[PDB]
Structures are given as structure tokens and as C-alpha cells.
Amino acid sequence: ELIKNYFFDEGAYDYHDGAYKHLIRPKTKMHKLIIPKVLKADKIEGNTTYYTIHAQEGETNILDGKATHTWGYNGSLLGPLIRYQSGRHYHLTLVNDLPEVTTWHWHGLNIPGPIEDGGPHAPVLPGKSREIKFDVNQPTMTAWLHPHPCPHTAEQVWKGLAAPVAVVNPLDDLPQLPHTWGVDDIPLIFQDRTFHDSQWDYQADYDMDGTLGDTALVNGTVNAEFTVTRPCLRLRVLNGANRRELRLNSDQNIVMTQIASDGGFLPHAIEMTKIMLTNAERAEILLDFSDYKKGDRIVLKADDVPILTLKVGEFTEDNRRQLPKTLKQIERDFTGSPSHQVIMEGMDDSVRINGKLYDMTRIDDRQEIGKNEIWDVSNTNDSMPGMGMIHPLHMHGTEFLVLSRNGKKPYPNEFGFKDTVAVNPGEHVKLLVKFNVPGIFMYHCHILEHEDTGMMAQIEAVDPNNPQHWNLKDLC
Amino acid sequence: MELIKNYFFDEGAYDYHDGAYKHLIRPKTKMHKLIIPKVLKADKIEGNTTYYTIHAQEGETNILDGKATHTWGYNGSLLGPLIRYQSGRHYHLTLVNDLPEVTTWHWHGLNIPGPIEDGGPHAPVLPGKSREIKFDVNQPTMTAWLHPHPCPHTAEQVWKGLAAPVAVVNPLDDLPQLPHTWGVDDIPLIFQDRTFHDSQWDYQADYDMDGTLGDTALVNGTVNAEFTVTRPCLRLRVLNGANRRELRLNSDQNIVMTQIASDGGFLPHAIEMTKIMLTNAERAEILLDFSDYKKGDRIVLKADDVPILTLKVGEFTEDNRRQLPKTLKQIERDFTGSPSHQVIMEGMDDSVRINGKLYDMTRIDDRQEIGKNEIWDVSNTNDSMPGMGMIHPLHMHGTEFLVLSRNGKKPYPNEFGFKDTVAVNPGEHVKLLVKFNVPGIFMYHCHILEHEDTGMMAQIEAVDPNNPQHWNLKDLC
Ligand SMILES: [Cu+2]
Ligand SMILES: [Cu+2]
Ligand SMILES: [Cu+2]
Ligand SMILES: [Cu+2]
Ligand SMILES: [Cu+2]
Ligand SMILES: [Cu+2]
Ligand SMILES: [Cu+2]
Ligand SMILES: [Cu+2]
Structure with missing residues (x-):
């Protein structure tokens, strides 16, 4: 009834790799936990809420010695809590104040691709800025914002670019x-x-x-x-x-x-x-x-x-409130053959999706919006402990259901929706996916050095009432 | 502790279930700034008595952003000011009528002598004329209101624009x-x-x-x-x-x-x-x-x-948050026994009737000794079959009461405090605990005003056993 163990296959954990690094408990003072500031709106005119976001340099005191040169959203490092609200429209002004190109990938949000998505198609040259519009229609959840250029995603996130996102749908929220x-x-x-x-x-x-x-x-x-x-x-x-x-x-x-x-x-x-x-x-x-x-x-x-x-510390209130046994209603009853297949393979520099690396101009799959397709994301690393690796599949523009892991029920906390799943070596994960908006999305391993090295493919979400020509250019 | 994520009353008898209901239309105008009703300044303070003047008058109010709107209003074009009382004080009120028809001043919430101070359908003020009244106030900290209550134009008059918020601060139970x-x-x-x-x-x-x-x-x-x-x-x-x-x-x-x-x-x-x-x-x-x-x-x-x-x-100027006590107010609720009063609300549209009778201004419908705690049984005999039923709110002049039970079950979570107006669902017996503090003639009526007009009103005498005042009743209507 109580779970007292970590979920994924231990044999393929990170620390087995030959160039792992243990964490070192640093000998610095206990610092006070930094809460990211809430992003105020620039104006509310109707069902539209206006947002400005500068990606900029700065210096942050992290250690108690020097400052640390950091990149960050509306700050020196990291970023503010960006709140959305399901059933609203949002105009965003994406200012670039960095010395290299960046994007704004809204990891969690189900918004048109590839421009609003902030995938490797939405570059903002230094000094320049960008404007975007999108509705929001999805459940109450925690997302985040990270850069997703090509091929410097890794470097940027490292520099200090990340920000939490909170998407409150009044319809499923628990206040x-x-x-x-x-x-x-x-x-x-x-x-x-x-x-x-x-x-x-x-x-x-x-x-x-x-x-x-x-x-x-x-x-x-x-x-x-x-x-x-x-x-x-x-x-x-x-x-x-x-x-x-x-x-x-x-x-x-x-x-x-x-x-x-x-x-x-x-x-x-x-x-x-x-x-x-x-x-x-x-x-x-x-x-x-x-x-x-x-x-x-x-x-x-x-x-x-x-x-x-x-x-x-001294408790000011009691903020305990009764929760419902069923936090959220979800249909999971879906059977049948997979109509899509993702074969993640290789480690180090052998990282490839269905044999191919990333081509920014190519479409690697197509799926009609609104329909429930079943995918089969898999991982063909060596299961023999130490030989294997845990790749997390992320998919832009959609939340999906984990149906099974090699035929068996998924881990006890995988019945809810997910936009990112772990794939153990020799594992076939069968997902249930549906795209709500149309457009071009990515699917990629979310180890950011794997992404940069081409473990990234694209899918077109097709509206059957608007076949669309996509003229996609390569930018690297 | 739980959080209420639902309305309270039986959905099957909501208003929208009426055949001729009208959905609310968001009007297409510019966002207007919310009008806060000004404070009613006293005319003089000499002692424990505070003097008040209140003119009910006509005028023209900018509501929409085009033409003005003919409105009736207290000391203003529309509605009225915040009238502050203070428990344990005396108040002299000059009620001026500057309308073109007869009005009253019903103090919905105040527990003051009936039926003249009450401003019930016995306290008319002919146009041009005015009236003076004196009353103490002795009741809890609470929000009341003032609306006209003549016979039978209560509805028309409220619609014209006659209403006003009232704040009664008793130092003894107020939370500052x-x-x-x-x-x-x-x-x-x-x-x-x-x-x-x-x-x-x-x-x-x-x-x-x-x-x-x-x-x-x-x-x-x-x-x-x-x-x-x-x-x-x-x-x-x-x-x-x-x-x-x-x-x-x-x-x-x-x-x-x-x-x-x-x-x-x-x-x-x-x-x-x-x-x-x-x-x-x-x-x-x-x-x-x-x-x-x-x-x-x-x-x-x-x-x-x-x-x-x-x-x-906007930009917060202060923090005005203050810890509240777990118990906001101490109330005795333990009271059992048989109901010594019964109110049977029945009928819709024009079938509206209290205990089978309509409103007779000269008739006393019930009697209860002041001071004592009596139990009432207000009920509603509309059809429980969803759609077929209606929610009638029982109001009683001159008293606050406690909701003891709803068909034997506990009342809704926010009904343990005192109330002067309670909703009655179809098929529901509501058992109230009532006590009159002053003596006098008070109404009890459904507070859908077009029922009060059609005649869903009955009167009660609150009797002082030691100092009775003989009642002769005359009809103005
Ligand atoms: Cu993402
Ligand atoms: Cu991501
Ligand atoms: Cu991504
Ligand atoms: Cu990978
Ligand atoms: Cu009233
Ligand atoms: Cu009243
Ligand atoms: Cu009344
Ligand atoms: Cu009624």
C-alpha cells in the first residue's frame, strides 16, 4: 500500500555510466530558498492577457564568494512563475537581450507549432524580439519554459535559462x-x-x-x-x-x-x-x-x-482540506495495434530515432488531429545492467497516456496524463496520443546533449479540413 | 474541513426552471467604475440620540453611457447611502417624502417597534408630507437594508430604484x-x-x-x-x-x-x-x-x-489581514420540542397563499409572547418533481431567528448564524427558533416582491404580557 522504492529499472540508471559524476555536498552556508517572482501581466484587454519576457544576461550570487555570470528570464538566472489560464488568449512579446539566438519552448503547453511552440523553428536573433498569440485549452498542471534552439539547447539551459509555468484550468483544478x-x-x-x-x-x-x-x-x-x-x-x-x-x-x-x-x-x-x-x-x-x-x-x-x-516554523494557518478519492476522471480503456512506432537507439554519439538523425526540413510522421492513435516508443539499449541507458521521450503539442510497459500496467503514478516518459532498455512503451491543435511538433529524447546530437524527429498534426503546405528551412 | 464547490438549495426548484425566465444579458457598454454609496451623515448628535433625515426623491442617473435613466432614490437619484446604526443607541428619523406617490421606510433587519417604526404597510408617508420616528437599537453586528414596503407597490417602488444598505455595529459582538x-x-x-x-x-x-x-x-x-x-x-x-x-x-x-x-x-x-x-x-x-x-x-x-x-x-497600500478566531460568535442552538407555530407557504404565480389565506391588513394571523423562544414550522407545498417547484424565501419583521432543521437534517453550512430570511425548497419543512424582543405588529411574507404584492403576507402580534397595547387595525391599500 505504501511505496518505498524508485520506479525505473536500476540496471540502466545514470550512475552506471563510465563518465558519471557523483554529487558533492558543497561546503557553503545554508542559503534561503529562492522563490521565482510571479510574472505580472502587461495589460488585460478582454479575454486576452499580455505578457513580455526578456531573455537576458546578469550576475547572480549563488555561492557566497563572487557573482556567477548567468542567463535568465526577466532576471539574472532562471525565470518567473508564468501563469496561464485554460480558456484564455495570450499575447507574448519575446525580447532577446542575449548575444546569441534563443527560442521560447513552452514545455507542457498545447499550442500551435512550430512558431508558438518555440521549437527550433522560432528563433529570435539578438536584439530583435518576437510576438505570438495562442489560446490555452488543457488541464490544471505544471509546465515549464526552456530554450529549444538547434543545436545549442543544452548550452543555453546550462547557462541558466529555465522557468516554471502554471496552467490553471478552473474545470479540473482543486483549490x-x-x-x-x-x-x-x-x-x-x-x-x-x-x-x-x-x-x-x-x-x-x-x-x-x-x-x-x-x-x-x-x-x-x-x-x-x-x-x-x-x-x-x-x-x-x-x-x-x-x-x-x-x-x-x-x-x-x-x-x-x-x-x-x-x-x-x-x-x-x-x-x-x-x-x-x-x-x-x-x-x-x-x-x-x-x-x-x-x-x-x-x-x-x-x-x-x-x-x-x-x-x-510556527504554523500561521491550518491549510489541510479534504481531497476527493478520485482527483480526476480519465478514460483509459483503449486497446489495439500501434499506428505509430518510435525506436530510440544508441548512446553517446550513436543516438538516433528510427535510424535517422534530426533534419529540420523533414517531416518524420503525420497524424490526424483529434484522433486517438497508439504509439510504441521503445529503447534498444543493452538490458544487461551497466550497458543500458534511460531515455525520456518528450512530445511537443500534446499530453498523452501511458497505457502499458511491455504489456504490463505502468508505474503507479503513470495513469495521469504525461508529456514526458522514461523508456528503460528493452522496453516497449505503448502511449495513447491525441493532438488538439494542428502544426509541426518535435519528439526527442530530453537529455539535451542527445537532442543536440540529432535525437529529434518532427511530426505534423494534420487538420483534415485544412491540408497545409509547410515550407520549413534549416537553421543551425 | 472540506470546501463548498456547490450552491446550496435544491436545483430542481431554481428560478430558471420557470417557463418565462429571462437569462442575464451582459450589456454592451464601457466598464463603469463601481459606485460606492456615500455615508449618511447625522443631522446632530445630542447624547445617546443621533438624528437622521432621509428624503425619498426622484432624479436621473447615468447608468448606460447614453441617455440618463429616470430613477427613484434615497438622498440621491438612485438607491441610497450606507446608514449606520450602533447597538445601544437611540435614533430620531425624519422620513421626508418627495416622490409623487405614497411610500414607507421598511428597515429590513432592524428589530424595532411595529408597525410604525418598522416601516411596514402601516407606516405610509403621503407625498409632500414627512414623518418622525424614535427607536432604540439592540441587536448583533450585521448588515441590514432599507426598502419601501407599501400596499401593494412594494415591488414597483424597489424597481424604480428604492433600496439602501444598512450597517448595525454592536460593540459587543463586532470583530474590528x-x-x-x-x-x-x-x-x-x-x-x-x-x-x-x-x-x-x-x-x-x-x-x-x-x-x-x-x-x-x-x-x-x-x-x-x-x-x-x-x-x-x-x-x-x-x-x-x-x-x-x-x-x-x-x-x-x-x-x-x-x-x-x-x-x-x-x-x-x-x-x-x-x-x-x-x-x-x-x-x-x-x-x-x-x-x-x-x-x-x-x-x-x-x-x-x-x-x-x-x-x-491594484497596488496594495497596507496589509489588512488579521487572524480570526475559530469561533466568530457564540450561539446557543440547543432547543428541542414541538413547533408552537406553523406557516404553510403554497402556490405559484397567483396561487400564492399563506395558510390558505391572502393578506388582510386588518387581521392578526398569529400571536406570540415576547422574550420567549418559540419554534416555527415554515414549509412549502410546491411540486418536488424537478421543474415544477419554486423557492420561496420566508422573511419575518422585527426579529432574527435560528434555523434548527431542514426536514430533520442539519441546515446548510452557513445557516447556523442568525437569519431574518430563509429559503424554503418544495416539500421542505423548515423548523425555526424565533423570539421577539420588542412588542408590536410585524409581517411575515415571501420576499419575492410580486408575491408580497399579490398578497403572500400575514401579520403577527408580539405581545408583552405585562404592558399590552390594544390594537385596532385599519386598511390602507
Ligand atoms: Cu516540450
Ligand atoms: Cu523540454
Ligand atoms: Cu523539446
Ligand atoms: Cu537520448
Ligand atoms: Cu424586506
Ligand atoms: Cu422586513
Ligand atoms: Cu417585508
Ligand atoms: Cu412567494
Whole structure:
């Protein structure tokens, strides 16, 4: 009934690789946890909400010595909480104030591709800016924004470009849940970085099988501590490393109630003392500190290494509210042969999707919008422990259902919608996919060095009432 | 603890189930700034007595952005000002009539001597003439209101534009933690439905015996109302002052409403909810909190899927949040036994009848000794079969009462506090606990005003056993 173990096949974990790097608990002061500021609108005129977002340089005190040269959204590093609302329209002004081209990929949002998507087709030259419009129609969930150029996605994210996104659909939201951002409701944006005189050098730490960093960050903070002012606490976890798998445990094995995955809430909640997330996998979780006095620390650790210390303070309210046994209604009853097939293969430099690398001008698949197709994403690495690797399939422009893993029921927290799934070596994952808008989307391994090296294919979501010519140019 | 994500009353008997119901049309005008009713300044304070003058008058109000709209109003063109009382005080009121027909001043909420001070259908003020009245006030901290209650034009007159919010602060039960800065962190939300004929209100045209409905929603006589929130906590004093329309208040972002009070003062404990339903005259004081909102973000409040008020978040000047006690007000509720009174509300359209009889102004329909706690059994004999039924709100003059039971089950979560107006669903027996404090003749009537007019009104005598006053009843109607 209670889960006390990490989910994916241990034999293929990251630490088996020959160029892994353990996390080093840094000898710095416990820093206070940085909450990303809420992005105010520039104006509201109707059902349209206006947003401006500068991607810009800056210097951030992360260590207690020098500043660190960082890139960031509307800031020095990282980015603000960008709230959307299902059933609204949004005009965004994407300013580029970096010295190289960037994009704005809305990892989670189901908006037209490839321009709004912010995939490798929506470049913004330095100095220049861009405007975009899109409706939003999807469930209540946590998304995020990262650059997705070609082929420098990895470098950019490393530099410090990431930002949490919150998409509240009034129709499936639970406002019982802690919603006081910063107090009872916080992000946990896990990242791994190496410091060279308090500076991040991507070129130095680069590895084509995934760039690892010896120090863990949390919302751009190191040795982060957070004072819990309230009994319930909703963490919105996110692995935004380039490769590192996030193995989240606690030093007192506090029960984590996972209420949501990437693409919205789970049918039912899932209690567990530990959790593994691959790159870009989100998890919304609830902890309860009723049975703790004041001053008691609860350390959260990536693997062996502390990353966030939850210090119990004087509770101001009681913010515990009854939840429904069924968090969200989802039809899962769908059988039949897969009408699509994705064969992820190779490691290091052998990374390829269905034998091919990425061609920006090519369409690699087509699927009618609105229809429920079944995909078969697989991984042909060596299952023999140590030989294998865990690739996470991400798909733009859609949330999908995990139906099965090699015929068997998916892990207990995979019944809810997902836009990012882990694929173990020798595993056939069968997904149920439906595209709501039309347009060109990507599907790619979300280890960002694999993406850069061509583990990226495109799909056209076709409207049957508007066959569209796509004139797609290569940009690299 | 749970969060209420639903209205309360039986959906099968909602207003929209009427054959000739009218959906609310969002009117196509410019967003208007919400009109806050000015404070009623005293005319003089000498001692424990505060002097008040109130002219009911005509005028012309800019509601739509084209032509003016002929309105009736208290000390103004439309509606009226915030009238403040204070428990344990005496008040001399000069009620001036500057209308072209007879009106009264019914103080809906106040527990003052009937039927002259009450402003019931016995306290007419002929045009041009005026009246003076004296009364103490001794009741809890609560939101009341003033509407005209003549025979039988109560409905017409309210429609013309006669209403006013009333605030009664008893020092003994008042919570000064709560936002008290009227116009800033503390505002009314007087919901009214009206139809415009070339920017003009025609009651006669829109009249229906089963309740007059209007295609446009007003809020403090404002249309497309916006209000700038200059502060984190905001205390709305919600009031349905329509003739029939039931106010189903919801938000498109499901902001939690913490109900602190009902009609007759505060609730024992606060009640969080994302939605709420109020029948006519039912008042609800609620708290919204905008902590988790940046600046510029709109929060729409809508009546049954039609916006009525846009709360725009502005630059907070203060933090006005203050910890509230788990118990907002202590109330004895433990009271058993057989009902010593019975009210049988029956009929729709013009079948409206209390215990089989219509309204007779010269007849006393019941008697109860003051001070004592009697139990009533208000009920409704409409058809429970969905569609076929109607929700009648029982109002009683001169008293606040406690809802004990609804068909033997506990009352809705926000009905433990005192009330002067209760909804009665079809097939429902509501058992109330009532006590009159002053003596005098009071009404009890359905507060759909076109029923009150057709004659869904009965009278009760509140009898002082020690000092009876002989009652001779004459009809003006
Ligand atoms: Cu994405
Ligand atoms: Cu991504
Ligand atoms: Cu991507
Ligand atoms: Cu890969
Ligand atoms: Cu009334
Ligand atoms: Cu009354
Ligand atoms: Cu009345
Ligand atoms: Cu009635």
C-alpha cells in the first residue's frame, strides 16, 4: 500500500555510466530558498492577457564568494512563475537581450507549432524580439519554459535559462490544495552544475552522453533551506538537469503524496517515501508536518546528497482540506495495434530515432488531429545492467497516456496524463496520443546533449479540413 | 474541513426552471467604475440620540453611457447611502417624502417597534408630507437594508430604484479585525436585475406575478462594474435586492469566499466556498484574499455565468489581514420540542397563499409572547418533481431567528448564524427558533416582491404580557 522504492529499472540508471559524476555536498552556508517572482501581466484587454519576457544576461550570487555570470528570464538566472489560464488568449512579446539566438519552448503547453511552440523553428536573433498569440485549452498542471534552439539547447539551459509555468484550468483544478505560491506552494527546480571560480563553463563539463555537474541546485539555490509556515506543503518538483536523474528521498522517509504528474493530476493520489524523475518529468507532491514540533528539519536529498532543508516554523494557518478519492476522471480503456512506432537507439554519439538523425526540413510522421492513435516508443539499449541507458521521450503539442510497459500496467503514478516518459532498455512503451491543435511538433529524447546530437524527429498534426503546405528551412 | 464547490438549495426548484425566465444579458457598454454609496451623515448628535433625515426623491442617473435613466432614490437619484446604526443607541428619523406617490421606510433587519417604526404597510408617508420616528437599537453586528414596503407597490417602488444598505455595529459582538474601511477594503455588492427600454426602467412592461425579471444585472446601480482592490483582504456585503432573481454568485477562477456573516450577524465559524446562492433579501458578508495575485490581474464575479463585477488588483497600500478566531460568535442552538407555530407557504404565480389565506391588513394571523423562544414550522407545498417547484424565501419583521432543521437534517453550512430570511425548497419543512424582543405588529411574507404584492403576507402580534397595547387595525391599500 505504501511505496518505498524508485520506479525505473536500476540496471540502466545514470550512475552506471563510465563518465558519471557523483554529487558533492558543497561546503557553503545554508542559503534561503529562492522563490521565482510571479510574472505580472502587461495589460488585460478582454479575454486576452499580455505578457513580455526578456531573455537576458546578469550576475547572480549563488555561492557566497563572487557573482556567477548567468542567463535568465526577466532576471539574472532562471525565470518567473508564468501563469496561464485554460480558456484564455495570450499575447507574448519575446525580447532577446542575449548575444546569441534563443527560442521560447513552452514545455507542457498545447499550442500551435512550430512558431508558438518555440521549437527550433522560432528563433529570435539578438536584439530583435518576437510576438505570438495562442489560446490555452488543457488541464490544471505544471509546465515549464526552456530554450529549444538547434543545436545549442543544452548550452543555453546550462547557462541558466529555465522557468516554471502554471496552467490553471478552473474545470479540473482543486483549490482545496495549497495555492499560496511561496508559502505553502513552492517549486523545486532541480539542476546540476559545476563551478570554476564561481562560474559555469559548459564547454569544460560537456559530455555528449549527457553533461553532469558536481553540485545540485534548487531554484538556482545551493544548500537551500525553506521555512514551512503551514502544515501542508505542495512541492512542484522538476528535473531541469541536462542528464542527471533526480532520485528524491528524505532523511526521515516522510510520506510523499503525489497528486499530479507532468500533464495534470493523477486519477488517485499515490503515497511514497521516494521518487525518481528523468529530465523534464514534473511531479506535484504533498508533505504533511502536523506530526512535527517547531525547528525540526526535514532534509530532501538527491541520492545521498541534501538539496533542500524544510525547517518547521510556527504554523500561521491550518491549510489541510479534504481531497476527493478520485482527483480526476480519465478514460483509459483503449486497446489495439500501434499506428505509430518510435525506436530510440544508441548512446553517446550513436543516438538516433528510427535510424535517422534530426533534419529540420523533414517531416518524420503525420497524424490526424483529434484522433486517438497508439504509439510504441521503445529503447534498444543493452538490458544487461551497466550497458543500458534511460531515455525520456518528450512530445511537443500534446499530453498523452501511458497505457502499458511491455504489456504490463505502468508505474503507479503513470495513469495521469504525461508529456514526458522514461523508456528503460528493452522496453516497449505503448502511449495513447491525441493532438488538439494542428502544426509541426518535435519528439526527442530530453537529455539535451542527445537532442543536440540529432535525437529529434518532427511530426505534423494534420487538420483534415485544412491540408497545409509547410515550407520549413534549416537553421543551425 | 472540506470546501463548498456547490450552491446550496435544491436545483430542481431554481428560478430558471420557470417557463418565462429571462437569462442575464451582459450589456454592451464601457466598464463603469463601481459606485460606492456615500455615508449618511447625522443631522446632530445630542447624547445617546443621533438624528437622521432621509428624503425619498426622484432624479436621473447615468447608468448606460447614453441617455440618463429616470430613477427613484434615497438622498440621491438612485438607491441610497450606507446608514449606520450602533447597538445601544437611540435614533430620531425624519422620513421626508418627495416622490409623487405614497411610500414607507421598511428597515429590513432592524428589530424595532411595529408597525410604525418598522416601516411596514402601516407606516405610509403621503407625498409632500414627512414623518418622525424614535427607536432604540439592540441587536448583533450585521448588515441590514432599507426598502419601501407599501400596499401593494412594494415591488414597483424597489424597481424604480428604492433600496439602501444598512450597517448595525454592536460593540459587543463586532470583530474590528475585519476590514472596516468602507469604500476601500469594505464594500457592498447590491445585486439587482433590470430591463432598459430606450435606457429607461418600465416596471409595468416587465411585470410578472411570479416574479419580475430583468435582462441586465446591476451592482450598486452600476453596469459592467469594476472595482480596484487597493488591499489584500476585501469584505463584500452581498445583497440580492432583485424582485425575484436568485443570485448565484461564482468566480471564473474559483477564488475562495470565506463567509463570515449571514443576514442576522456573524456565523459561529467561517465557511469557505467557491460559490454561493442567495434568495431575495438574503445578505452575506464574505472575505476574498488577493495575496496570491500580482497587480493588474482581474477577478470576475459573475451571476449564473454572467459577469457583474470585475475586481482589478491594484497596488496594495497596507496589509489588512488579521487572524480570526475559530469561533466568530457564540450561539446557543440547543432547543428541542414541538413547533408552537406553523406557516404553510403554497402556490405559484397567483396561487400564492399563506395558510390558505391572502393578506388582510386588518387581521392578526398569529400571536406570540415576547422574550420567549418559540419554534416555527415554515414549509412549502410546491411540486418536488424537478421543474415544477419554486423557492420561496420566508422573511419575518422585527426579529432574527435560528434555523434548527431542514426536514430533520442539519441546515446548510452557513445557516447556523442568525437569519431574518430563509429559503424554503418544495416539500421542505423548515423548523425555526424565533423570539421577539420588542412588542408590536410585524409581517411575515415571501420576499419575492410580486408575491408580497399579490398578497403572500400575514401579520403577527408580539405581545408583552405585562404592558399590552390594544390594537385596532385599519386598511390602507
Ligand atoms: Cu516540450
Ligand atoms: Cu523540454
Ligand atoms: Cu523539446
Ligand atoms: Cu537520448
Ligand atoms: Cu424586506
Ligand atoms: Cu422586513
Ligand atoms: Cu417585508
Ligand atoms: Cu412567494
